Every structure is written in structure tokens, then in C-alpha cells.
Amino acid sequence: DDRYEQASDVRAQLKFFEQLDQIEKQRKDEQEREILMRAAK
Amino acid sequence: PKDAQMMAQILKDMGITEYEPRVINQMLEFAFRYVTTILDDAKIYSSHAKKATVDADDVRLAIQCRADQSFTSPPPRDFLLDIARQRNQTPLPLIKPXXXXXXX
Amino acid sequence: LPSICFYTFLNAYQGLTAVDVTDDSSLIAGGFADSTVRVXXXXXXXXXXXXXXXXXXXXXXXXXXXXXXXXXXXXXXXXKILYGHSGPVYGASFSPDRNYLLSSSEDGTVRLWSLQTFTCLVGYKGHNYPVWDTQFSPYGYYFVSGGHDRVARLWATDHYQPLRIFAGHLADVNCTRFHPNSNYVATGSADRTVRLWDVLNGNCVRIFTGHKGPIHSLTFSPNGRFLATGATDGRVLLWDIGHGLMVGELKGHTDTVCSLRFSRDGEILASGSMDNTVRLWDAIKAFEDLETDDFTTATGHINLPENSQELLLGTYMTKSTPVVHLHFTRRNLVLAAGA
Amino acid sequence: NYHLARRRTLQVVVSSLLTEAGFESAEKASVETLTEMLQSYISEIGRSAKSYCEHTARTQPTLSDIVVTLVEMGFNVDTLPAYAKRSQRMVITXXXXXXXXXXXXXXXXXXXXXXXXXXXXXXXXXXX
Amino acid sequence: KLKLSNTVLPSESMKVVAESMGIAQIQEETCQLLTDEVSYRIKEIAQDALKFMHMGKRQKLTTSDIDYALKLXXXXXXXXXXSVEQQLYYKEITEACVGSCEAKRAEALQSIATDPGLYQMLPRFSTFISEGVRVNVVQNNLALLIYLMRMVKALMDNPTLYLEKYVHELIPAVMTCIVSRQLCLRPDVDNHWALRDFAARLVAQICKHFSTTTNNIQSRITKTFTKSWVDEKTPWTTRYGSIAGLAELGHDVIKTLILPRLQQEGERIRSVLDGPVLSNIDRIGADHVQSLLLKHCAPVLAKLRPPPDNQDAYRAEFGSLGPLLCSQVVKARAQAALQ
User: Fold this and answer.
1) Chain E residues with CB inside 8 Å of C16's CB?
2) Which residues of chain C lie closer than 8 angstroms to A14, CB-CB?
3) Which terminal Cβ of chain D has fewer Cβ within 10 Å, N or C?
4) Per-residue DSSP letters for C133-179?
5) Which chain E residue's Cα is nearest to D107?
6) Are E248 and E224 in contact (CB under 8 A)?
7) What 8-state DSSP symbol labels residue E165?
8) CB of C174 closer than 8 Å to CB of C184
9) Of D59, D119, D125, Cβ closest to residue C320
10) ∠ CA E232-E233-E235, rounded to 5°
11) Phi then psi dihedrals of residue E246, to 5 deg
């Protein structure tokens, strides 16, 4: 009954940074596939 | 009084210059109370040697105990042992994703 | 026209050490359990409000095609105070990619703080001892931490275990800094000697001979070739690595060389000491032989009122020089050169 | 020097609690030593909760954390409502004091002549 | 070149401290070696707290530091002193001293009071400032007067620019502002009294710095105002400026001076009051002057005498002070009750 405390938003925020890093890592893998398609171009 | 003179001689022997005297005095009084606790230890080991006097040996085991108490340092043998341990280990694994820095 | 322009920040005292990297912000390790951050030239940012709700993270991920500006949702301020320590903080720096604060307490603890939450991401130990110096790598996957217990320790981002130990001195480590390439570090200490160190085995690769007083300062060069080591003699030694030579001697700072910096790439030193003194040093010293000696009269100084100098930065990206000034107020003062 | 007033504020809290006790006189150095003991007790709470709520990967020390801290630091918390009858109901709260100001000045000459000349950095202020 | 003998406490005093707990009959060498051991640990910890504050980088040692230690053949043409730049800065200073906009006024005032190291736009500045004082004494213009006198005030508080060598063409301009005939208009003599107040206040700020030497300050200005007060058949502006300057010199100054001048200037009062047929300029002037100097002289005898027997105190002060002296004594008792 954490009606007083939130006790959140850090490991949650670490997961948010993990989400940002997952977006950037998907962008990096997409950039790898993009260079591979430029090779396929 | 005279104790301030003793501390002035100390800080001249310390060679460095600028202080507050209240710092100096509270050094003095806590140091004297450490001396009185040494005297308490002298009472104890006079009692358990069952003698009314305080020997030099009493001073010896009191300072041995309190040098075990508040006089720490890391051992250079333990330093060399830790050196052999961790410097023996030469692993350094490198990953692609590196924003994560934890598993608590 | 070399000139000391000023800044003006908040007015207090208890400042201990203060480090910047890429000029937008400085790190005032001040008030005896504190790590304050001040901002240069930008207003403020609160990137963690998008993390404050998972749906706010979801709305950020809606703009995750190409919008890093949308990552912020800046709903907070500047000049923030960051503290979980209970120690008089003794070292700090930025990550070189501006992601990871590094706080270096007395407490034994050592903490990578956030660059978006501005909280302690990770906070840990390795000592029951005062942990004097820490320093990121120039790249920053590792960093070093030298302390009280006559060791010096690498750390990863993640590994939470000392990846290497450099227990070669016999007293308090004062400074410890990376090479330009992240393999080699230097460590200077209370027992007056410098020891260089590896990355792969970690044995003491080179020793530079004890200069007659406890070390407070050391630098490397932007080409990664040369050394300044300033000591309590008021005295700088230009060292070289592969020849291991005490090349150059500089003196007159009157006894506590706190801030050394080989500036923008050429041999133009910035230097500063306790008695509110800053000397440049225009001294192009370069040779290769068996033994050597030199002489004085390179450059002249510039002074200050009562504000001794914690650290210093030869300006990354410009011929400029900011310093940090703490006996009055947290005033970063900026000055130039050009002889 | 300027730190000291919070310590003497704690001395005021000490005198308030002695007034609630009812001591007419006291020994001054003992009083200030007890004040030091009080602030060290505060810091002892803070060290305990500090290293105790780092046992979560997150930081924020909540109520039950400090409950387990004070029971760990030896206190029967059941008297805390009843001590409220003594604390905020029989002693008047003292107010703090902090008088900070930012004075005004003007030294207007008319010369800058190099805003961000060759060493270009748009974070400075050229003097005159 | 140095000898560090052991700071050893006298062991008899140590036995007094020991047997204060009532231990035993103690031999000397025991307490001698005890003082030795404790001195070793103290001086070790002293080196340790030095290592603390020489990385916290302050040369003063607090209690808190040791608390953290307890974790165990035609010549070339001339060139002036000025630059063209700073003489134009000087021209800005002068025309802001003219300045109608009070923002420009206060800007000038702050620029005076806080340009240390200026020192070289000194005397030439102040010299024909004093010459302008003389010329506008002739011109008899209060605005230039108040501008110059606040200018001298701001000159007095710029702490680096030492007055000593350049004193002796400034102070007579102040006293010429004190003495007489500041008569723009006869119904507008009102502001000139406040000018004299401010001027004597400035003299009071002068006198606390320079009379250690040659006693031009105290002895000459006191005897000046002495024989000036003696000067019969002079305008009462002279009398007001004299007595106000003596008032600004201090409590004991007036205690000396207006001890006979209490009833002698009361004789001057009732020579003025209930005096002439008609000269209401001089009547109203001298009347408010006597009133001002009355209740301004009042705190001396208020600090001197107790406030009893106001009817007798008026007899002790020639009547005309009564009961304005008694009303001021009531005001002084109220000011004491404010404490």
C-alpha cells in the first residue's frame, strides 16, 4: 500500500534508457543492413 | 594554558601553518580522553593480573589491543597477493551494446 | 589581447574539486556531501520526464523515427545538486560522451551518476578507504580510481568488480590518469614516485623518479607523448615516456602545483598553483639523446585574488583556457593566450 | 564561520527540550557536547538509511525503511504518536533564519570591440 | 636545518590526570612512554589530516577534517599618463557626474566606488574636480555641489585607491562646501543644510583614517571649527557647518565642546530667539539650525546625564533647550526601550 511512496522511475528509467538504447541499436542494425543494401545496390 | 603550548610545539613540528585553536583544543581533549581509556585498560589488566601496579607489560598489551583497534592499514603482502590474483586475470570481454552498466 | 574575462555563479564555499569536459557544464564537487552541476551557455534540460511515465516513454518512442530532441520533455531546471554521498567528495569528471558523471567520495563509494535522471545510476565500493582520484578513459568504457590503500583499480561500465589492481606504491595515491590511448595509465602518490601501468597484465611498466615532495598533479600530452608532473616543490617536471627522462624543470609557483594542462596540441602549458597563480609556459622543448639539461625564463604569469585553482581545461575545440576558482564564489574564469 | 548558526540552532532545540523537561540550570559545555551527540545521531540515522536503502537498486528511502532503521538503531516507535502530545503540542516551533541578497551595480562604459573574435566562444563576457 | 624533538607532556601532570580516576602510585617512565605513544598516534593522525586538507586544498584544518581522519636635439613628444581609451572613460565619468539621469548617476557612483586598480585616473581627475568645486562655489550651484560630494563619498569607499598622498587638495574643497554662502536662493537654503550634514558626515568618514600621522585632520579641523565658532558677526551657515562638523567628530568630542557651549549657544539661541526686530531669513535659518543642533547634540548629554529633573536640566542648559532637550531625552529613553 504505497499510497505515500512512488518507489519507481529509476530502474524504470533504466528500462527507459534501455528502450532508447534499443531504438538506437535497432537503428544501428538497420544502418548495418543499409550498408549491406548499398553493397547490394 | 600549557597544553596550547604543547600543541604549538606540535604544529611547529608538523611544520604547517594555519588552523583554528578550537580545532586544536578539541584534538587535545579527545586525545586526553583516549589517554584515560588507556588508563582504564591499565586498571583492567592490573585487576586481572591481580596486582595494584601497572606494569610496562600492561602498557604493552593495551597498546597492542588498541593498535589492533584504531590503527588500520592494508598489508603489502596482501597487496602482492591481490596483485597476483587480479593481475593474473587478463580477461577483458568487449560487447557491441554498452549503455547498460549494471546487474545489481 | 590575452585577458581574464569572468563568469559569476553561486556564492558559497566548501568547494573541493571541479571538473568539466566538453565545455557545456562544469562539475563542482563542493559541499562535503554534494556534487553540484553548473551549465555553461545552455539553459536547462530534463530528459527524464519522458522516463517519468512509461507512457511518456511510449510517446517518445512514437517519435523514434528520427527525433533526439523529442527525447527530452524538459520540465526542470539548471544548476542542480546531486548527492547521495556522506563524504567530502574528492574527484569527479564527465564521461567524454556526456552520459556518465563520475563522483569520487571520501566514503569509499564511487558513483556513476545519470545524465538524464541526474541520479546515481551505479554506486559501489572497493575500499573502506578515502578514494582520492578517479578519471574516465578518453573513450570511457573503463575508468580508473586510485585511493588511500596504495592500490589503483580499473573499472568497467558494468562489471562491478575491480578489473585490475596496481598496488605498487606504499601510501596514498594522489592522482591517476589515462593515456590518450586507453591502455596506459599513470599514478602518482604520496610516496613521491610515479608509476606507469599497463592494461593487459598490469605490472608497473615504468617508474619516474621521486620528485622531492608528494605529487599533486600530472598530465599527458594531446599527441600522447610527454608529461608534466607538478609537485609540492612548486616544481614541474617535463617527462618523456619511452626514454623515461626528467627532461624539463619549471619552478616559482610556490609549492602546490594543482592544475596542469598541456593545452591545444603544441607545447603551450597552462599551469596553476595554490597561491592564486597561473603561469603559461611557452617552451618548445624537444630532443633525443642520452642525458639533458635546460634553463628557465619561458613565460610570465597572471595572478588572482583569494581563489586557488582546483582544475583547469585547455579548451577542447578552441585556443582558450577556463579555470575554476574557489575561495570566494564558484566563478569559472576564462582567459586566452597567443604568443 | 557561517556554518555555525545551524549548530547553534540545534542548541536552541536542545534548550527547548530542556524547557519541556524543566531544568532551570545546566552545564554549558556538556549541553553543547550533547548537541554534538545529537547531530551525530542524525548523521548516524543518515548513514544507516544511506547504506541500507542502497540494498535496493533504486535509492529513495521510504517510511518502513526508516522504521526498520530506528528499530535497528534501538527505538520503540509506538511512543511516537504519544510523544507527539509532548512534541508539537507542548513546545513551540522555532523559525529558521537566512538573509541572502543580490546587490545591484552598473559600470557602463561603451567598448566591447571583440565579441567572439578569433578564439570564438559564445560563452564569456568581454570586460571593456 | 631542523630538529623535531618529541612534544612530551609532563608525566606528573599525566599522573594527576591518571590519579584523578584514582589509579595507583605511578612511576615516571610508564607515563613518559605513554605520552610518547599517544604523541606518535596524534602526530601520525596529524600527518593524515594534513593529507586530507592538502587534497581538499585548504591550508586551514577544521574539526571536520580530523573527524574524517577518524575513520580508523629636440626630444620626442610626450605621452600622458592616460590612454585615449581611459581618458574617454574618464570623460564618461565626468559627464555622468553631470548626468541628469539618476541611473547614469548611480552607474557613475558604482563605477567610482568599485574600480580598484584605477589609480591613474587619480589625481588629475580629483584635482580639477576640486577646481570645479572652487569655480562652482563662485557659481553657487547646489546641484554641482551634491554631485561632487556624493562623488567624493564614492571616492572614499573605493578601497584600493589610497588617499594619503593626494589628500591635500581635496579636504579644503570639502570644508569650503561646509562653511558658508551656499545661496542659490534665499527660500531655497533648505537643501544646503542637508548638504552640510552630508559634508560633515563625509569629514567624519575622513577623520578615522589619517590623524595617526601629522595631525592636520583632528587638530587643524577642530581648531578651525573652534575659532570658527568663536567668529562673531558671521552668517549662521558658518555656525551650522562648524557645529555640525564638530558633531560628526564624535561623542566625546561634543562632550568636550558643548559642555560650555550648551549654555553659551543657549545664549546665542536667546540672542536669536526673542531677538531682532525683523530678519526672517536669518531668523528661520538660525532657528532651525539651533533646533537641529540642539536635538542632534542631545544624545551626548543623554548618554551623559540621567533623564531626571527636566525643569532643573533646563536650568542646567539655559532654559531654551527645555523641554526640547527633555523631549529628545524622552525620545532617547524610547530608543533605549527599543533595545
Assistant:
1) 56-57
2) 121
3) N
4) EEEE-SS-SSEEEE-SSS-EEEE-SS--S-SEE---SSS-EEEEEE-
5) E111
6) no
7) G
8) no
9) D119
10) 110
11) -70, -30
